[PDB]
Design an enzyme around this catalytic site. Structure first.
Site, PDB file in Angstrom:
ATOM      1  N   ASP A  35       0.914  -1.379  -0.147  1.00  0.00           N
ATOM      2  CA  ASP A  35       0.559  -0.182  -0.301  1.00  0.00           C
ATOM      3  C   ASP A  35       0.621   1.715  -0.120  1.00  0.00           C
ATOM      4  O   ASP A  35       1.724   1.643   1.085  1.00  0.00           O
ATOM      5  CB  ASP A  35      -1.306  -0.041   1.104  1.00  0.00           C
ATOM      6  CG  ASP A  35      -1.441   1.371   1.256  1.00  0.00           C
ATOM      7  OD1 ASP A  35      -2.142   1.996  -0.288  1.00  0.00           O
ATOM      8  OD2 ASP A  35      -2.534   1.622   2.441  1.00  0.00           O
ATOM      9  N   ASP A 220      -1.715   5.401  -4.843  1.00  0.00           N
ATOM     10  CA  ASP A 220      -1.776   4.570  -3.775  1.00  0.00           C
ATOM     11  C   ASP A 220      -2.323   3.534  -4.466  1.00  0.00           C
ATOM     12  O   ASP A 220      -3.277   3.421  -4.769  1.00  0.00           O
ATOM     13  CB  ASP A 220      -3.206   5.192  -3.572  1.00  0.00           C
ATOM     14  CG  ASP A 220      -3.992   4.725  -2.381  1.00  0.00           C
ATOM     15  OD1 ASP A 220      -3.567   3.626  -1.861  1.00  0.00           O
ATOM     16  OD2 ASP A 220      -4.506   5.091  -2.002  1.00  0.00           O
TER      17      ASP A 220
HETATM   18  C1  LIG Z   1      -3.799   6.108   6.680  1.00  0.00           C
HETATM   19  C2  LIG Z   1      -4.216   7.437   6.227  1.00  0.00           C
HETATM   20  C3  LIG Z   1      -2.448   7.352   5.962  1.00  0.00           C
HETATM   21  C4  LIG Z   1      -4.748   7.224   4.870  1.00  0.00           C
HETATM   22  C5  LIG Z   1      -6.299   8.330   5.665  1.00  0.00           C
HETATM   23  C6  LIG Z   1      -7.315   8.531   4.335  1.00  0.00           C
HETATM   24  C7  LIG Z   1      -7.036   8.381   3.067  1.00  0.00           C
HETATM   25  C8  LIG Z   1      -5.955   7.573   3.203  1.00  0.00           C
HETATM   26  C9  LIG Z   1      -5.465   7.233   0.688  1.00  0.00           C
HETATM   27  N1  LIG Z   1      -4.612   6.021   1.498  1.00  0.00           N
HETATM   28  C10 LIG Z   1      -5.516   4.764   1.492  1.00  0.00           C
HETATM   29  C11 LIG Z   1      -5.379   3.382   1.348  1.00  0.00           C
HETATM   30  O1  LIG Z   1      -3.963   3.039   2.272  1.00  0.00           O
HETATM   31  C12 LIG Z   1      -6.785   2.534   2.158  1.00  0.00           C
HETATM   32  C13 LIG Z   1      -5.717   1.095   2.015  1.00  0.00           C
HETATM   33  C14 LIG Z   1      -6.785   0.013   2.724  1.00  0.00           C
HETATM   34  C15 LIG Z   1      -6.713  -1.838   2.562  1.00  0.00           C
HETATM   35  C16 LIG Z   1      -6.725  -2.613   3.185  1.00  0.00           C
HETATM   36  C17 LIG Z   1      -9.413  -1.915   3.305  1.00  0.00           C
HETATM   37  C18 LIG Z   1      -8.596  -0.767   3.476  1.00  0.00           C
HETATM   38  C19 LIG Z   1      -8.059   0.019   2.980  1.00  0.00           C
HETATM   39  N2  LIG Z   1      -7.371   2.263   0.830  1.00  0.00           N
HETATM   40  C20 LIG Z   1      -8.195   2.360   0.592  1.00  0.00           C
HETATM   41  O2  LIG Z   1      -8.880   3.311   1.983  1.00  0.00           O
HETATM   42  C21 LIG Z   1      -9.788   2.715  -0.132  1.00  0.00           C
HETATM   43  C22 LIG Z   1     -10.333   4.072  -0.076  1.00  0.00           C
HETATM   44  C23 LIG Z   1     -11.674   3.069  -1.593  1.00  0.00           C
HETATM   45  C24 LIG Z   1     -11.927   1.763  -1.097  1.00  0.00           C
HETATM   46  C25 LIG Z   1     -11.084   0.817  -1.071  1.00  0.00           C
HETATM   47  C26 LIG Z   1     -11.495  -0.572  -1.437  1.00  0.00           C
HETATM   48  C27 LIG Z   1     -12.332  -0.713  -2.509  1.00  0.00           C
HETATM   49  C28 LIG Z   1     -12.301  -1.584  -0.026  1.00  0.00           C
HETATM   50  N3  LIG Z   1     -10.447  -1.433  -1.199  1.00  0.00           N
HETATM   51  C29 LIG Z   1      -9.953  -2.518  -0.492  1.00  0.00           C
HETATM   52  C30 LIG Z   1      -8.540  -3.458  -0.674  1.00  0.00           C
HETATM   53  C31 LIG Z   1      -7.534  -3.655  -0.970  1.00  0.00           C
HETATM   54  C32 LIG Z   1      -8.296  -2.232  -3.183  1.00  0.00           C
HETATM   55  C33 LIG Z   1      -9.481  -1.630  -2.575  1.00  0.00           C
HETATM   56  O3  LIG Z   1     -10.114  -0.832  -3.831  1.00  0.00           O
HETATM   57  C34 LIG Z   1     -10.278   1.426   0.010  1.00  0.00           C
HETATM   58  C35 LIG Z   1      -4.462   7.445   3.462  1.00  0.00           C
END
Ligand SMILES: CC(C)c1cccc(CNC[C@@H](O)[C@H](Cc2ccccc2)NC(=O)[C@@H]2CCC[C@H](C(C)(C)N3CCCCC3=O)C2)c1
Length: 377
Positions: A35, A220
């Protein structure tokens, strides 16, 4: 020796890409989602219905408790747990072991995924956005500090059930074609970049370029979709709708909710436009573009119906926290996270997406005046 890391990623479409790692002594093997959109290394460390296995701190002689809690709320999903350190290795990665911070996940909500084969997450971005605060050194910083692995990594994420490569410490020239084009990392927190122009089927969206990066733009790998700020999202959907108005799409399709299907092999790819994203370049008044095919932003999903048609979901989502160049943008490009030189490189991937008459491309140079006015602040 990068060949040892080729094809070290697996995943399910829409569910991220994971690499195998071991934590503790003796080594406990876990699949870890990679990630670039966050900065905490965290693993399931307590039973959960969707976990096949989890980190058992009790069984590791090298485990150290940091006696400190932690939680991370993502855009969707969150977890909380307990901080500690332990010895970490990557079997299909460089031949090293490092003591790294690990968040032992004890509770979670909509984080782990049913039937998913990963049990944790490796946040590859910078300490500035690590929880609970920036004093918790991220894994890659520990790796570079403790070994002679060079301070960069590259990701080749491949579409079609998906695979790819994370090359730790360098660039493997067999994984891409053509030239690498670099865009500056604007600030070391997320991998933040600046988009200076957008075109759809060659047509300029014609917005104040600040809108493209309101309030930031990031690369990302932990997000499936392209996510676009409200104003940009609406312009892009309006243009994509127009281009494809030949066909009719269900309700909620353009919301990413509802899927659309065609008889196998008859998907009308031609009526969906390419999207070109121009990125700030390395020299004055200079940019380059990456061009995205519809095969990237229409994500293939299984038909829960009795039919064996080709079905897809619209993989572009509206955002209120800036642009996110997610996995479907990165797919079919080779992306180099050159931390040492504060830049991110893009080249056409060896596993590029195929279309009958169009191709994903990285092209340059272009001239673009006043690029600095594109950054938000
Ligand atoms: C932590 C801090 C610095 C932070 C706070 C807000 C935004 C961000 C920007 N990066 C986000 C990633 O770190 C995080 C990774 C993630 C991986 C696995 C599960 C959930 C999140 N991904 C998400 O939140 C995404 C938001 C849209 C729906 C996404 C869904 C469809 C769910 N998803 C989950 C499995 C991996 C692929 C995927 O698409 C998850 C960072």
């Amino acid at each position: 020796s990068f060949v040892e890391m080729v094809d070290n990623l697996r995943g399910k479409s829409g569910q991220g890409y994971y690499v195998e790692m071991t934590v503790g002594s003796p080594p406990q093997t876990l699949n870890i989602l990679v990630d670039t959109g966050s900065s905490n290394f965290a693993v399931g460390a307590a039973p959960h219905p969707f976990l096949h296995r989890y980190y058992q701190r009790q069984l590791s002689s090298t485990y150290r408790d940091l006696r400190k809690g932690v939680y991370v709320p993502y855009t969707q999903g969150k977890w909380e747990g307990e901080l500690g350190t332990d010895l970490v290795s990557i079997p299909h990665g460089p031949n090293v072991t490092v003591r790294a911070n690990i968040a032992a996940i004890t509770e979670s909500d909509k984080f782990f995924i049913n039937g998913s084969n990963w049990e944790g997450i490796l946040g590859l971005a910078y300490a500035e956005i690590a929880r609970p605060d920036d004093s918790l050194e991220p894994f890659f910083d520990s790796l570079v500090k403790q070994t002679h692995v060079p301070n960069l990594f590259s990701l080749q994420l491949c579409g079609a059930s998906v695979g790819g490569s994370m090359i730790i410490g360098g660039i493997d020239h067999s994984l891409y074609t053509g030239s690498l084009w670099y865009t500056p990392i604007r600030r070391e927190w997320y991998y933040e970049v600046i988009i200076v122009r957008v075109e759809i089927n060659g047509q300029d969206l014609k917005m104040d370029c600040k809108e493209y990066n309101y309030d930031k733009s990031i690369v990302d790998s932990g997000t499936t979709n392209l996510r676009l700020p409200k104003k940009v999202f609406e312009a892009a959907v309006k243009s994509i709708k127009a281009a494809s108005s030949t066909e009719k799409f269900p309700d909620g399709f353009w919301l990413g909710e509802q899927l659309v299907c065609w008889q196998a092999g008859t998907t009308p790819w031609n009526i969906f436009p390419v999207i070109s994203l121009y990125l700030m370049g390395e020299v004055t008044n200079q940019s380059f573009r990456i061009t995205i095919l519809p095969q990237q932003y229409l994500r293939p999903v299984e038909d829960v119906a009795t039919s064996q048609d080709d079905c897809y979901k619209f993989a572009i989502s509206q955002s209120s926290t800036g642009t996110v160049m997610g996995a479907v943008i990165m797919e079919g490009f080779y992306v180099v996270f050159d931390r040492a030189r504060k830049r991110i490189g893009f080249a056409v991937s060896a596993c590029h997406v195929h279309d009958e008459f169009r191709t994903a491309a990285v092209e340059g140079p272009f001239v673009t005046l006043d690029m600095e006015d594109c950054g938000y602040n």
